[PDB]
Structure 1
Amino acid sequence: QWALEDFEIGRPLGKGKFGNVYLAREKQSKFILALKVLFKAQLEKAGVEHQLRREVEIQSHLRHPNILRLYGYFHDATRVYLILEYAPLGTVYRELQKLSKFDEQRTATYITELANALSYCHSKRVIHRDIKPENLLLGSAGELKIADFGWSVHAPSSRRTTLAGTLDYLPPEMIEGRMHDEKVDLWSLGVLCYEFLVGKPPFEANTYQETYKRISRVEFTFPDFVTEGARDLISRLLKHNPSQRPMLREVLEHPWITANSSKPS
């Protein structure tokens, strides 16, 4: 169906491990979109074709306003091209580097938008497993959108792929290679809530080996400026035991969320 020839390419939007993402406009319709470019050689040397297919499968079929759309794909012997919804206000990552810390209202609104999208996902037993600021994008009204379903699967699951980069958002069961479920995304939600308020993730460390130690032991402390209600939500989400983590509904109905979020469930 589609091919490269159908598109005028524009400025580089961002870069990932395999992904190189470009602004693009579709010649006949003038539709603006984002083109994610993957190199087949890199994909094969890493053996992550199954991830690519899972990404295309899962994300093309989901439909939620806080989830980034995927319209289609094509290839051309060197590369694979995913055709995505363009997010005009960039990443949450970028926004956090601009402001250093988010206030409480900004944080709770992001958490609500996140919890809504994740609840939709979990209702299909889809778990994302790679929730972090580089993979959260912003729509034209500033609304949060989850993206990059490269690592998503159906629960329950084990991990058959090597953990490549940062450990900062992964729960103890994932880094210890154990079996896991939905509750992994709840842990990541706690990590995110903390990093939104403090400006760095709660188990951050200088080396891999040490980050690993801080996560399996759940060693984190709060700065003075973190309020009691934020502390309560975060302490509930960062439980070593998955079953002790709240349901998403309890996150959306938590007093601190309801008092600070400007969007509803």
Structure 2
Amino acid sequence: RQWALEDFEIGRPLGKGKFGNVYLAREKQSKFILALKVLFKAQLEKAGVEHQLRREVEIQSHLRHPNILRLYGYFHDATRVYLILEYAPLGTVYRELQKLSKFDEQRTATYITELANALSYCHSKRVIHRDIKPENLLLGSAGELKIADFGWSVHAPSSRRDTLCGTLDYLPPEMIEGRMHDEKVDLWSLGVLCYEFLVGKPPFEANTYQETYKRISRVEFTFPDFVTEGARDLISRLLKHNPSQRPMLREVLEHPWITANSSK
């Protein structure tokens, strides 16, 4: 119908962003838990984003996928916009990558299947350029993976070491280089995710922004010796200066190494 803040109990902040925080929450009657994104909107003015958000939340409102975090509804009071969100109990793949220090091919190829499916759904719905770096990826009920994306970056207090300057590691050469982008943007990311999954760090990591840029644009990246070659093939194919040379999501999902180690 139409919600307002008084319909919700508020728990801890799950993450705190620059435009506001995501809080643990539950609808008061059903006692059903969700996540409430809170956007200050005075900060939105400056950043220049209001009305273009107010169309999105509609474009996102229509999106139904198991691997995408569902936006239930949205409202506003005076000074805040509220996104009513699905709760992902297990948090960020980023905390996890910190925990285990790296993943294996079963975990990886499985997540990658999950992502590829979201992106492909998104594409069929004419939605491109999701932010799939690990901090925006969440973990649902059992193992499952969920693209959050959407609102502007929230973190969970931790670590605090690599923060932003986590920036362009996942950015494709065409995006960085001040050019437009087709749907192909997202397969570059896919390739960077996979690498980080197995390696524990992204392929272009460097102490200076310009050097990171160097390797990205020049597609300069190596592998540690433990990376299976089917991984190598997939990543190598995924990361190409030319968007054209990059796969459609099909052959990604069809990829030998994927099919092998993918639990889904």
Native 8 Å contact 1:51 1:151 kept in 2: no
Runs of 4+ residues deviating >2 angstroms: 50-55, 149-165
CA deviations over 1:110-169 (Å, ceiling 9, x no partner): 000110111111112210342210111111111001112248999999999999971111
Whole-angstrom distance in 1 between the partners of 2:94 and 2:86? 18
**Distance in 2 between residues matched to 1:218 and 1:82, nearest whole Å:** 38
Cα deviations across residues 65-97 of structure 1 (Å, max 9, x unaligned)? 111100111112221110000001111111111
Question: Structure 1, residues 172-199: CA drift from partner, whole Å, max 9, x if none?
Answer: 1101110111100000000000000000
Q: TM-score, normalised by structure 2?
A: 0.92
Matches of 1:253 and 1:111 in 2, distance apart?
12
CA–CA distance in structure 1, aligned partners of residues 134 and 63 of structure 2: 21
Q: Distance in 1 between matches of 2:25 and 2:158?
A: 36
SS of 1:126's equivalent in the other structure is: coil
Shift of residue 55, structure 1, vs aligned partner = 3.7
Taking structure 1 as the reference length, the TM-score comes to: 0.91
Question: 219-228 vs 120-129, which deviates more?
Answer: 120-129
Return 181-190 or 9-18, whichever deviates more: 9-18
Range 48-57 or range 249-258, more displaced: 48-57
CA RMSD of aligned residues (A): 5.7
Query: Cα offset for 1:249?
Result: 0.5
**Counterpart contact for 2:138–2:145, Cα < 8 Å:** yes
SS in 1 for 2:240: coil
Distance 1:127 1:94, change over 3 A: same
Q: How many Å apart are 1:52 and its aligned residue?
A: 2.5
Q: Which runs of 5+ in 1 are unaligned?
A: none
When structure 1 is superposed on structure 2, of 227-236 and 7-16 the one drifting more is 7-16
Is contact 1:135-1:147 (8 Å) kept? yes
Q: Please, which runs of 5 or more residues in structure 2 have no aligned partner?
A: none
How big is each residue's C-alpha offset from its partner over 1:194-244, in whole Å with a ceiling of 9 and x where there is no partner?
Answer: 000000011111122221111111110100011111000000000000000
CA-CA distance at 1:2 after TM superposition: 1.1
8 Å CA contact 2:18–2:154 kept in 1: the answer is no
Q: Say which is worse superposed, 39-48 or 12-21, in terms of deviation.
A: 12-21
Does the Cα contact within 8 Å between 2:14 and 2:156 map onto a contact in 1? no
Distance in 2 between the 1:63 and 1:22 partners?
Answer: 22
Q: Is the 8 A contact 2:67 2:114 kept in 1?
A: yes
Give the secondary structure class of the aligned counterpart of 1:168. helix
Aligned residues: 263
Instruction: Sort the Cα spacing of 1:161 and 1:40 in 2 relative to 1 into closer, same or farther, 3 A.
Output: farther
